[PDB]
Design a protein around this ligand. Structure first.
Ligand SMILES: [Zn+2]
Lengths: 35, 46
């Protein structure tokens, strides 16, 4: 789980933080696309 | 020494102005708490 926020780029999001800062405790999904 | 805000994690007295970055000095943490009045509060021992 991370937080892609402005004023910075990205950092790890912990549950208590998300609870307080009203963010979603979600993680990034990446897929390898072939061509 | 001047008291306006405190950090949650590191708990370092911050004291920042309106639009002076919501982050904490030392740890780059955006979680802040307010002072508490110097206006001494009174209660009934009941
Ligand atoms: Zn701090």
């Amino acid at each position: 789980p991370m937080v892609n926020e402005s004023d910075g780029v990205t950092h790890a999001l912990y549950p208590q933080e998300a609870r307080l800062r009203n963010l979603t405790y979600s993680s990034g999904l990446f897929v390898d696309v072939k061509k | 020494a001047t008291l306006k805000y405190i950090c949650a994690e590191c708990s370092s007295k911050l004291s920042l102005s309106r639009t002076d970055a919501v982050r904490c000095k030392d740890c780059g943490h955006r979680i802040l708490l307010k002072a508490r009045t110097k206006r001494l509060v009174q209660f009934e021992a009941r």
